[PDB]
């Protein structure tokens, strides 16, 4: 369903834009082909409609839902305050803490796309397949989410 | 099921709803966080659901608390609970015109009273001024109730009494 996927992307972009300006730390993992059921069950179940508003309310500091991962599965916010594994990568910059290391860790054992907001700088990062793309612009964020979450790769790969 | 193995599914969902309300209101009350939670019963509240932001979410004390954090997108209005979901947040409810409602009470109390006049909803209010917990039902206000009185009214009004042995067997619902 192309329509739900474009809404998902917009919801991620607007919520992370708001948190970034406020240096609110956040972690959103979007499940793809590999199952994330065991990580979903570690958290508080929501099974909620996706909206930028609900994503922002989830991550407000010192609230019951903020301390852990949001996992998006199908067309729902499946859970909040979920556990994710921590990467032991030594290549990760020293100013990045356990949130970035959790995002990297999940990307190492799933094909999920994970978006991170830094509580120190408000920079936005992405992880995929054991790798981190640090401090992306608004345009780069949009381009990678469109490519990785909207199925309609139809054109020749070179482009 | 997910909730537990005792009694019927409906019973467990209703006891979880009650506990979710009690825990969330206790947390908000000590922080003087304003809150307004309306539980639909036999009366449709679909039109008020449509005024809010849709959530269609599993009920938890945690989600109720996060919804009402001040100065957030979801806090400004009513949560409406319908079936076994948090249907919407930041919904508009009608205001009561009653002059019998104390002027010391704010817009949340007047919205809670207003909905209770045209539905058989149970509505819970946390006052941002006093931290008191209030309840409305059928045009009446129960003001600044104790934890014990809150539990007693929620049990009576929100838990369907069901037969004992019949409750342990799950019925087929097409799945
Ligand atoms: O607990 C409130 C919740 O229960 C439901 C059924 O899931 O309502 C049923 O039980 C109520 C209280 O015992 C009754 O008022 C009602 O008539 C009955 O449908 C939900 O509709 C309600 O939100
Ligand atoms: Cl469409
Ligand atoms: Cl951080
Ligand atoms: Cl950064
Ligand atoms: Cl259950
Ligand atoms: Cl508390
Ligand atoms: Cl108030
Ligand atoms: Cl008390
Ligand atoms: Cl008491």
Q: Across the interface, which of B56, B61, B73 has its CB nearest the CB of A48?
A: B56
Give me the domains of chain A, ranges plus CATH numbers.
Answer: 1-159 (3.40.1700.10)
Give the sign of the dihedral formed by CA B4, CA B10, CA B14, CA B20.
positive
| Contact residues, chain B, for A63 at CB < 8 Å | 65-66, 69
Q: CA nearest B59: which of B136, B11, B3?
A: B3
| A17 near B CB under 8 A | no
If one residue of B160, B163, B167 were mutated to test the ligand 1 pocket, choosing by the most ligand atoms within 8 A of its CB, it would be B160
Query: What SS3 string covers B60-102?
Result: CHHHHHHHCCCCCCCCCCEEEEECCEEEEEEECCCCCCCCCCC
Q: Residue B107 annotated as binding?
A: yes
The secondary structure of chain B as a DSSP string is --S-SSS-HHHHHHHHHHHHHHHHHHHHHHTT--EEEEE--SS--HHHHTTSEEEEEE--HHHHHHHT-TTSTT-SSEEEEETTEEEEEEE--PPP--TTS-TTS-HHHHHHHHHHHHS--EEEEE-TTT--EEEEETTEEE-S--HHHHHHHHHHHH-----TTGGGSPPPS--
State in Å: Cα B75 to ligand 4 middle. 30
Residues with Cβ < 8 Å from A24, sequence gap 6 or more?
A18, A59, A60, A61, A117, A119, A122
Q: Give CA angle at B121 (B96, B21), nearest 5°.
A: 110
Q: How many CB atoms lie within 10 A of CB B21?
A: 24
Structure tokens at A31: 């499940």
Read off the tokens for A40.
Answer: 């979903």
User: What tokens appear for A124 in the block?
Assistant: 């936005």
Q: Which chain A residue has its CA at the smallest distance from B87's CA? A: A48
Contact B112, B38 (CB under 8 A): yes
Residue A74 touches partner B, C-beta closer than 8 Å: no
Q: From CA A111, how far away is CA A124, in angstroms rounded?
A: 19
Can you tell me whether residue A98 is helix, strand or coil?
A: helix
- If 0-12 CB within 10 Å is exposed, 13-18 middle and 19+ buried, where does residue A112 land? buried
Q: Residue A85 and residue A43: Cα distance in Å, rounded?
A: 13
What are B107's two structure tokens?
Answer: 């817009």
Q: Which of A52, A10, A23 is nearest to A141 (CA)?
A: A10
User: In this structure, what DSSP letter does residue A111 have?
Assistant: -
The structure tokens listed for B48 are 């008020």
What is the experimental resolution, given in Å to one decimal place? 2.2
Q: Is B53 on the interface with A (CB under 8 A)?
A: yes
């Amino acid at each position: 369903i192309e329509r739900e996927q474009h809404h998902l992307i917009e919801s991620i972009e607007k919520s992370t834009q708001y948190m970034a300006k406020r240096r609110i730390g956040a972690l959103i993992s979007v499940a793809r082909d590999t199952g994330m059921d065991d990580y979903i069950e570690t958290g508080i179940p929501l099974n909620a409609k996706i909206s930028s508003q609900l994503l922002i309310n989830i991550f407000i500091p010192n609230t019951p839902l903020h301390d852990g991962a949001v996992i998006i599965k199908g067309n729902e916010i499946a859970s909040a305050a979920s556990a994710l594994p921590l990467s032991d990568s030594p290549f990760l910059s020293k100013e990045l803490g356990t949130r970035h290391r959790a995002a990297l860790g999940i990307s190492e054992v799933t094909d999920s796309i994970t978006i991170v907001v830094s509580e120190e700088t408000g920079g936005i990062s992405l992880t995929k397949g054991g790798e981190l793309f640090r401090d992306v612009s608004e345009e780069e964020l949009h381009k990678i989410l469109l490519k990785e979450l909207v199925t309609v790769a139809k054109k020749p790969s070179i482009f």
